[PDB]
Each structure stands twice: as C-alpha cells, then as structure tokens.
Amino acid sequence: FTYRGVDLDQLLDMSYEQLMQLYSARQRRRLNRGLRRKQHSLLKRLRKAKKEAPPMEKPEVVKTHLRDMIILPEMVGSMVGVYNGKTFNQVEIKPEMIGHYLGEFSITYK
Amino acid sequence: YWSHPRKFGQGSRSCRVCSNRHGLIRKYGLNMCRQCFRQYAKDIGFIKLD
Amino acid sequence: GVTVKDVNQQEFVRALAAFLKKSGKLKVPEWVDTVKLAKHKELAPYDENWFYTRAASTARHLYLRGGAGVGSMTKIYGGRQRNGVMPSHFSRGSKSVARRVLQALEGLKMVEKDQDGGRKLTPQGQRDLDRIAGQVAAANKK
Amino acid sequence: DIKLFGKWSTDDVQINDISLQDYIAVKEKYAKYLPHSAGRYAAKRFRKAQCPIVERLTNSMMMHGRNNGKKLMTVRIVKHAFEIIHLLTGENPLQVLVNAIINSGPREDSTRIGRRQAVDVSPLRRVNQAIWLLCTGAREAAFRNIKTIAECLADELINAAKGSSNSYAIKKKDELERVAKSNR
Amino acid sequence: IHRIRITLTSRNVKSLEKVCADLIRGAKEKNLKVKGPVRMPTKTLRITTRKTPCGEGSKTWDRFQMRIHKRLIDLHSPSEIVKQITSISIEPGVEVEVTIADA
Amino acid sequence: VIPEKFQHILRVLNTNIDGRRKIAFAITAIKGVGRRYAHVVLRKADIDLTKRAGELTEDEVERVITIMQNPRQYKIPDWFLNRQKDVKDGKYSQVLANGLDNKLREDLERLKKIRAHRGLRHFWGLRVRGQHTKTTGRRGRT
Amino acid sequence: NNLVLFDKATYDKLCKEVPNYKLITPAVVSERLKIRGSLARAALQELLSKGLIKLVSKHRAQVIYT
RNA sequence: AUUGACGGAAGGGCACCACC
RNA sequence: ACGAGACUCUGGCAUGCUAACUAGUUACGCGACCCCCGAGCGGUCGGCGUCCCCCAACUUCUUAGAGGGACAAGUGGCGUUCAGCCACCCGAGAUUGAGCAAUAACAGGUCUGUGAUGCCCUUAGAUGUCCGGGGCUGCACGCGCGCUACACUGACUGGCUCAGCGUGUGCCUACCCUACGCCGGCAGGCGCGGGUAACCCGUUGAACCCCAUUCGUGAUGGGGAUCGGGGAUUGCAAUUAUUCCCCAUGAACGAGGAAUUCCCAGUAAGUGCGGGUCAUAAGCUUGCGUUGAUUAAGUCCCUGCCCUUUGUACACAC
Numbered sequence A: 001f002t003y004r005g006v007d008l009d010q011l012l013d014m015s016y017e018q019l020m021q022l023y024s025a026r027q028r029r030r031l032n033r034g035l036r037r038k039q040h041s042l043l044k045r046l047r048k049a050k051k052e053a054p055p056m057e058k059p060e061v062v063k064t065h066l067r068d069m070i071i072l073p074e075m076v077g078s079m080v081g082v083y084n085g086k087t088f089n090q091v092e093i094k095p096e097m098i099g100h101y102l103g104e105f106s107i108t109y110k
Numbered sequence B: 001y002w003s004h005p006r007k008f009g010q011g012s013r014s015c016r017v018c019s020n021r022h023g024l025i026r027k028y029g030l031n032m033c034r035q036c037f038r039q040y041a042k043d044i045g046f047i048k049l050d
Numbered sequence C: 001g002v003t004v005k006d007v008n009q010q011e012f013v014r015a016l017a018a019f020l021k022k023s024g025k026l027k028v029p030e031w032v033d034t035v036k037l038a039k040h041k042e043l044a045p046y047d048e049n050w051f052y053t054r055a056a057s058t059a060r061h062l063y064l065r066g067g068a069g070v071g072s073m074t075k076i077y078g079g080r081q082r083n084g085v086m087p088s089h090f091s092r093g094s095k096s097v098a099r100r101v102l103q104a105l106e107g108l109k110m111v112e113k114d115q116d117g118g119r120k121l122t123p124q125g126q127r128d129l130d131r132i133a134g135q136v137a138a139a140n141k142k
Numbered sequence D: 001d002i003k004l005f006g007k008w009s010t011d012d013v014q015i016n017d018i019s020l021q022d023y024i025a026v027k028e029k030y031a032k033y034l035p036h037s038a039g040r041y042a043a044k045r046f047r048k049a050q051c052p053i054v055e056r057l058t059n060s061m062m063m064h065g066r067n068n069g070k071k072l073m074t075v076r077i078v079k080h081a082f083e084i085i086h087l088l089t090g091e092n093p094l095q096v097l098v099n100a101i102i103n104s105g106p107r108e109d110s111t112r113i114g115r116r117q118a119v120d121v122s123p124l125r126r127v128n129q130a131i132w133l134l135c136t137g138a139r140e141a142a143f144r145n146i147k148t149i150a151e152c153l154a155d156e157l158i159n160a161a162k163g164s165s166n167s168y169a170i171k172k173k174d175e176l177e178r179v180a181k182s183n184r
Numbered sequence E: 001i002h003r004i005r006i007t008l009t010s011r012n013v014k015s016l017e018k019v020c021a022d023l024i025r026g027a028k029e030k031n032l033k034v035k036g037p038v039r040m041p042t043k044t045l046r047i048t049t050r051k052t053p054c055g056e057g058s059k060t061w062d063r064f065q066m067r068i069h070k071r072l073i074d075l076h077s078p079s080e081i082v083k084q085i086t087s088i089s090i091e092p093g094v095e096v097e098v099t100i101a102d103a
Numbered sequence F: 001v002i003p004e005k006f007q008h009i010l011r012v013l014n015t016n017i018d019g020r021r022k023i024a025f026a027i028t029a030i031k032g033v034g035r036r037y038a039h040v041v042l043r044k045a046d047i048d049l050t051k052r053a054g055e056l057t058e059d060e061v062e063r064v065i066t067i068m069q070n071p072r073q074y075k076i077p078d079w080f081l082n083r084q085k086d087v088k089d090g091k092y093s094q095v096l097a098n099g100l101d102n103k104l105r106e107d108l109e110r111l112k113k114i115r116a117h118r119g120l121r122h123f124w125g126l127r128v129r130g131q132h133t134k135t136t137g138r139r140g141r142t
Numbered sequence G: 001n002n003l004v005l006f007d008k009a010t011y012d013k014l015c016k017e018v019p020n021y022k023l024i025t026p027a028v029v030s031e032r033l034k035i036r037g038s039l040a041r042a043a044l045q046e047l048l049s050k051g052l053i054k055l056v057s058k059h060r061a062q063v064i065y066t
Numbered sequence H: 001a002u003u004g005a006c007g008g009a010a011g012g013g014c015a016c017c018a019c020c
Numbered sequence I: 001a002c003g004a005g006a007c008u009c010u011g012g013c014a015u016g017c018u019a020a021c022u023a024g025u026u027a028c029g030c031g032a033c034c035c036c037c038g039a040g041c042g043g044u045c046g047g048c049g050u051c052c053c054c055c056a057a058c059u060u061c062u063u064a065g066a067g068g069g070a071c072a073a074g075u076g077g078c079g080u081u082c083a084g085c086c087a088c089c090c091g092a093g094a095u096u097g098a099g100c101a102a103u104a105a106c107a108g109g110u111c112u113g114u115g116a117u118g119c120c121c122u123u124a125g126a127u128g129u130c131c132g133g134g135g136c137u138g139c140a141c142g143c144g145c146g147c148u149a150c151a152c153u154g155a156c157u158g159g160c161u162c163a164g165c166g167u168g169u170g171c172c173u174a175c176c177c178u179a180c181g182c183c184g185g186c187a188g189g190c191g192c193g194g195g196u197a198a199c200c201c202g203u204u205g206a207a208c209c210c211c212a213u214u215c216g217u218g219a220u221g222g223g224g225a226u227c228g229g230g231g232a233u234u235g236c237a238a239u240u241a242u243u244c245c246c247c248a249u250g251a252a253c254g255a256g257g258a259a260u261u262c263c264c265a266g267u268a269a270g271u272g273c274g275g276g277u278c279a280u281a282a283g284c285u286u287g288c289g290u291u292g293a294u295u296a297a298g299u300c301c302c303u304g305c306c307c308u309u310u311g312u313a314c315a316c317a318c
C-alpha cells in the first residue's frame, strides 16, 4: 500500500505541515485552520484505545459524533463507531481511507 | 448553553418588532419582518406612490 | 497630419502589432502558448502571435482614455461566459496577461505610471502610435 | 438620386399590377438609402403600406426567436441577396423583388365558415402574404444546409419573380388557390 | 471669513424649498455673496414586498418608496453672521448640516 | 492538391483517428485528449495547425505521440494534466486511450472496496454529486 | 461525402468550368463539385489570387465572386 | 304577487387571464 | 351620493425663468503628438489651469424647482346637425404606464409574522429551551413554473464600440463597494488608498450586435448532461459533492403527439446589468436599459362575465 507515493510508516512519522502537501485542497485547508478540542480529544481517545489492546485483536470501539473529522494516518487500524443520526455504525479504518472523512462510512439513509 | 456560533445566518438576525426570523428585510438598516414593514411603512415614511 | 482617431482602428491594431513584432524589443512570457486569455474562453487564441496584437490593442486603449490599470484592462477585454445549462454572464479577463502586457509596454518606454494611479502613455508612445496611424492612413489611399 | 445601398436605382422599377400599385412602396418618395428607419408604422392602421418594401422584407426576416431583434444582420443579408440577384439575372434587384411580390401573392383564399367557403384577398393582405411566403421559403431552404441565407433568399425570389414552381412561395400560392377554387 | 456650506435634506419639496427661500432671502438682506440652491439628484429608496402575510393569492406586490431631496447653499461670511441667518423657524421635516470650510 | 501519401485513416493508439479532419481536432478522437490538450501538444511540437491529419508523415505522427505520452518533459504545465497527484503512484501524468479506462475502473473499485458513500452510489447506479434524484435521471432507469 | 482535398479530375473541373459561372461563391462550388466549404474558400481564394475571377463582395459571412 | 339564484331557455354587450 | 372619471406618481416638450468646483459646455493660456516648403484663429487630448476670486463667461448638454403646454382646440365628412366617431394640418405629444379603487360577500388563505387572540392540549423523563448528530435534498414513477439546446440568420478565436435603474462600512450585528501596485495560468493571495457617497468604485469601457479568422451539414469545432483527478475561497464545520477555477469523459436531443399559455408598439422576442434572499451563493423573483419586429384597429364562433325578457314545486340559491 502507498498513498501518493509515500508508504505508511513515513506517513506516520511526518508532521501535519508535511502531511498537508499530500492531501487534497479541502483537507489541506481543514488542517491549515486549527483542529478544535473535540478532534483533539477524539485523537486522544483513539490513541488510548489503541495502546491498550492485546496483540492480534482489534482495539475497542470508540464512539463519536464527529462525522467531519478527517482520517489522519494515526487513525488507521483503530475501530471507530460513527453516529449516523440514530445508531453508531462500526467502521474499521483501513489505510485507503486517509483522504476521506469519517462521515462517508456511516450511511444516514437506506 | 448558548455555545453555538450565531455570527451569521438566519439564526443571527431577527425582526426588531416581533423577533421572527423569516421574511426579514435588511435593506437600508431596517431589520424588520416583511409583514411588520407592511404595517409600519407609513409611520417610517414609505409612501406608496406607484 | 493624421492621428490615431482619424483611421480605422481595426486595421491600425494590425499595423501596430506588425510594428511591435518587427522591432524585437517586446518581452513575451514563456506561457503564451499554453493559456486562455480569460476564464470564459474555451480554447487558446487561434493566432500564434496573439501577444503582439493584445499589446497593440491596449496601447491604442491607452492612447484614448489613458489612466488605466489591470482591473479596468480586464473589464475591457472581458466578455460573455456560457455556463452550460445555466444562463450567461459577463466575466472579466485574465489579470496576468494584462499585467504582463502593460509591463512589457513599460519596458518598451511607451507606457509609464500615472501620478494618481494607473498607467498612461509617454510622449514616445504618442509619437509611435501617431506615426503608425500616419502609415496606415497613407497606405489606405493608394 | 437616392440609390438603395448606394448602388441600386429605383426610378426604373415597374409595378405591372394595378392592384398592388399603392402597397409596394419603392419609388419617388419612398426611395431610401437603407432598409432601416425608426418606423412607427404599426401605430395606426394602413400606415405600414407607407413603409419601403425592402424594410418590410428586412423586418420579416428577423424570425424564429434566435434572430429576433437582429436587424443589422437582416439588412446585410438583404444587401448580399440583392448583389447575388444582380449577378444571376442581370437586372435591377428591386424589379425582381417587386415581380416576386406580385407573382407570389395569393389572390383568392378560403376562410373557415362552419367546409371552407372561398373568399377574395385584400391587396395589403396579399402583399403581407407574399412577403411572409418568400421569407419563410428562404428561411426553410437555408436551414440545415450548406447554402447561406443570402443565396437561398436570392434563388427563392428569383424563382418567384420568374414564375417557376421550384420556389416555395409559388407552391403555397398554387395550393391556396387550388383549395379556394375546389371549395368555392 | 470662511466658505460655509449649508446642506438641507428633507422628504418633501414644499417645506424644503420654503426653508431655502428663507435662508437665501435673509442672506441677501445682509449683503452676502450667496451661491444659490444647488439641487443634488433625489434619492429614491424602494422596497418591493409581497402584499400577503401568508403565501397564498395571485402573487401581487407592493411598491413602497421614499424620496430624499438635498439642497446646498454656499455662504462667504463670518461665522456669527450665519449664526443669525440660520435659526429662523426651521420646518420639521427639514434637517440642516453646517460645514464650516472643514470637516 | 492532394499528396499521394495521404493517410486516409490513422491507427495512433489502438484507435482509429479519422483522416480528412483538421489535425488539432483529429487527435481529439483519442480518449483522454480534448481540444485544449490537443492544441497545446500540437503547439509544443512544430506541427502546423492548418493541416488535415492525413497530410502528415510518420515523423510528425511519432513526435505527436511522444509529446502527448510524456507531457511534463516538453514543458506542458502540471495543471493541464488529467491525473495530477495520483492517489497510488503520486506522479503527475496524462492518462490516454486505454489508461483512462483502467484508471476509471481502478478508481471506482477503490471507492467501492472501501465502502465509501460515493463508491456505494456508483455501485447502486445513482447520482454521486448531490443532485436531486426525485424528478431527473429517469432515462437510464427502468 | 465531400472531398477534403482535390484530386486530379475535380481540380481539372474547378479550373475548366468554375470561371464561367455567373455567380461564384463557396456554397455553390462546394455543391456542384462535391467538396467541403473550407476547400471551396481555399480554391476560390487561390483563383482570385491568380486573377481568373473577380471579387464582388467580401464579408465575414458571405463572399461573392464572378 | 315581489325580490334573488338557477334553466342541457330567448335576445343584446364586453374581454389576447376569449377567439380571429 | 359612492364606484368610473377627476386625483397622485411617472414618460415625452421648453436654446423661455431660477441656479450650480459634489454637473458640465464654450472660449483663453500652458503642455504632448502629427504633418509642413516656413506653414495654421490646423487637427487629437476624460492632459493641466482660469476656486488665491477675476487673473473667463455661460447653462445647450446634467441636475431639480416654479410655471407653461393638449382641450377632440382648428379644418373637412358622418351622426337625430345631440353626445360623439373618422381623416388631416399645426404640433414634443391628438389613447404613456401604473397607484388608489364602491355596496355586498366567500366557512377562500394565514393561529408557522406578531408581547393580535378565545378555547382546548402540554408544562420538569415537558409539545418550554439549549447542545451534538441526522432529515427537509432520500428514488421503479406521474404532473407544474423554468434554464440550456437541437446549429451555418451558427459555433470558435481575435479586434472594435455603446447603457439605465440602483447598492455600498450596519443599535444589538460579527457580515460593505472597491480603484491602483506586485505574485499566480485561473479561481485567488498580499500591500496600499478612496468612499457614510452627483465627491470613491465610475466617463459604471455590460451582453446581444458590428468587423476579420477557422469549420463545413457529420450527432460535427452543434449540445454540455454524466463522471475521474487536482487547486482555491466562505465558514466553527463543505461527506449526502456550498460556491468558483483547470484538465479529462462527451449522454439524450435532428424543432417536439393529443392538448395548451402569453401577447398588439419601443409591445413580443433576443440580450445582458442591478436589488431581494446573501458568512458562501441565482437556472427564482423584482426592477433597469439595449437591439427591435410579424400580425390586427375586428367579432361573439369557442371560453367566460354583465344586462333584459321569460319559467320555478328553488330562499343553506338542484
């Protein structure tokens, strides 16, 4: 797997500013303006729930209302429950969804 | 409480007579509902010449 | 005696463009072959030497109603934009073409910077445009 | 000496039909340099019979809604059609136009009373009908075809003025008279 | 001595013109070079609304409008003389704005 | 006036480029090449725009293929290209006749294996750009 | 199926019977001889340059020869 | 017997929200 | 007597009056440029000045006040010699366009405009109110208002030349219109100045149109739906794509059945520009100018209204 030429481990190492050049214009503008306390707390909880799971099983699901949180490369592998208005749909974050938002993985209709 | 930003949009603006948010007239700095304008027009000075 | 007003402008522009292209002193940007002259065009200009024609046209447009800038220059060269299935609207021309053209003319010593703001025509620009107008008016009566 | 478009004389035309003499306005007072004037001819009744016939032909060519209001275009296509006529025939284009009006006008129509009883046709209305038939013949001949509207207008009213049946207006006139004769 | 400019604004022509007449006459009586009434283009403020309070009917509209008229008077005289030229029974719908050669 | 080596039809990129058509609009029959890209390609090469496709010989055809296959080498700007900042490769380039179909297929399957919203709406066969589906789009559906 | 470029027979016909038309214009030479309008304009401009035919009028929409 | 409304009654007039 | 008309606003006229550096014109002086023999009460100038008070006057154009002006007044004809109608002269104009708009009504619409309101319901696990997310936009289909088109009376590229309404920095209220200079191919970005406005944007360099080039009757360089990739802007947040820009893909559509709408003079139609909505934004509406017609000066056939006569077992109107 590669994302705009660069591999996953380098994507993990680089800062937000270097990461901005590998995104689309929408995600670069969203990272140019800050990330508020909601997204920082979501990243905190995702990090905490990934660093406490035993080996060879998925991390515990982390529910969230934030459907507009872009998927950083420190979110891959982790399990998220995204609200769709009524329920928390489970999304296993796979490395291909770096660019996309969390919102377009929990459908809000039928 | 009143945490959500209300710096623009229909939520920010309300009529200066009834505090209704629909049909608002903002031209010339009125900030009045269309019906309230239609009622107070003669008092404000908006004659209906043509 | 002849002046720029006393001659067909559509042929005066071709004469001035041929003059500018003749004397190899106009500066051309490297992207001339790859750009549309406005966001409302569909293709690039059909004329390879479009830069000389645009420079001559704005030299004429600075002889009369002098004192202009890149904004007014992109409202002179703006046109109609067809928005697909939506109605059409007036849209301005590209600013970089206009700025490069005016700076190239400034490098030719024809155009200079006005006092209040904008760009006007030097006495040398007046002299050159009037001599070109004399040439086209003379070549019309033969 | 007022010449249409600067080159077409107007005192040697001949309206050979007495009925249409005072509706095809082309000479002595009606001479003009161009088929364009701020008209005010639709103000009162019959005032459009005092309009030059080339300006009526120009007016009736601004049609189908993509050419509405575009009068300068119709003025130049009339100018170019007249030059084509003078090349093809070898006679004054105003004469050819006047003869096309006279030949292409229907002189007996059929109105709906009910079955359609035959009726006679006014001179002004048959001038109107002649102009409209020539214009629509030219218009439908130039649509989806490599010929231009000037050549189609020229060949239309040339075939009209000569009287042949390959024009569209002569076909329509013959059809109108044929029904209005079979249904008297 | 200054270039004092009096600007008069009103919504009706009658009282505005009569206040202008009073000012010009008072200034002419005391021998002033009075550059007389300049008339700026009247501003028409227009608001077109729907007539109905609900949204049902025949879609008729209501065209309210308000005109604003503006007049100018230029005096060339000391301040204390304009302080008695003015202050003579200004009509209600008229509003004056003295500008004493500076903002 | 016709040259005896007039190629009536071309086979440039496993596609049939119709001769008897103007060269700038001839190569437009290749998928991935449109009017603006064809004009900038033919302008970077020394090919006269006022030519019917069949009038060219093999040298100009090979040069046209080389310039359109490798646009960045011949100073065609990055913003011109179809596939800028590729998701997987990361390389700026222009996808041609068969590459644009493999790339469109690979794009839809990327967005569909991931179960994104746009990919699901492509799989179901609906509009994916926010359009109202209530009254339009009924042709392609039973 | 208009010819984009003249062959020998059509070029012979254009040189041997087009300068004897009362009306010459790019829409009647491109219909008697089956050629495209662009080839017609090119051919008539070449004939005018050589001097066989005379220009009556020149417009951006209609050009007329003799 | 009177006023209104109606008549798949009988006469007049009007309207490019009717026609020609 | 009310309604109609009169009335009010608006359009058209005034070389007559009142005036104007927040509008100009014309002279004069200075300056630039062009011809020239030596040339000139020569030509172009939205270049500058006459606002230090004469070292220039004036109001034609612009603005807006007061008056004037049109009344079927004059001349023929018809008409009961009546009201009036038709034509014509002189005229700016011989029917400019709207606003207001009666007696009675309608179970017409609005309790979702209101600190207009009766009654009923609910009132702390609230139908109050706030916050987070979703939805109004969902898609086999059936209608209505529209926008773009089907091309050559055209599309594309370049060149040249013209508008009129009117808006603009805000109590709470954050959010204005923008000239000029420099980056960028574009959307855009960064500096810096003017404007609370006849002062600045702005002489609002609008589009159609006009002039030249390419194409050539082909679903084509007509049409631009659908869709892939990228770049910016607004926002606290753009995915179910806000909007804008660039490359690419290139569908139906070849003038539309039965039916049906709207309209008679600067009108229909074409074509753009403002206002409202608006942090972001018009395929909508409301106004504005621009190019500018075909047909008609009639009728009761169709669709509806109004009057009169006539029949009624109808009066909550069969």
Ligand SMILES: [Mg+2]
Binding pocket: C075, C076, C077, C078, C079
């Ligand atoms: Mg323009």
Ligand SMILES: [Mg+2]
Binding pocket: D142, D143, D144, D145, D146, D147, D148, D149, I152
């Ligand atoms: Mg044609």
Ligand SMILES: [Mg+2]
Binding pocket: F133, F134, F135, F136, F137, F138, I139
């Ligand atoms: Mg659908």
Ligand SMILES: [Mg+2]
Binding pocket: none
């Ligand atoms: Mg009809």
Ligand SMILES: [Mg+2]
Binding pocket: I107
């Ligand atoms: Mg009800």
Ligand SMILES: [Mg+2]
Binding pocket: I110
């Ligand atoms: Mg109510």
Ligand SMILES: [Mg+2]
Binding pocket: none
């Ligand atoms: Mg909520």
Ligand SMILES: [Mg+2]
Binding pocket: I136
């Ligand atoms: Mg809705």
Ligand SMILES: [Mg+2]
Binding pocket: I145
């Ligand atoms: Mg409706």
Ligand SMILES: [Mg+2]
Binding pocket: none
């Ligand atoms: Mg196109």
Ligand SMILES: [Mg+2]
Binding pocket: none
């Ligand atoms: Mg195509």
Ligand SMILES: [Mg+2]
Binding pocket: none
């Ligand atoms: Mg708007």
Ligand SMILES: [Mg+2]
Binding pocket: I284
């Ligand atoms: Mg709406």
Ligand SMILES: [Mg+2]
Binding pocket: none
């Ligand atoms: Mg109807």
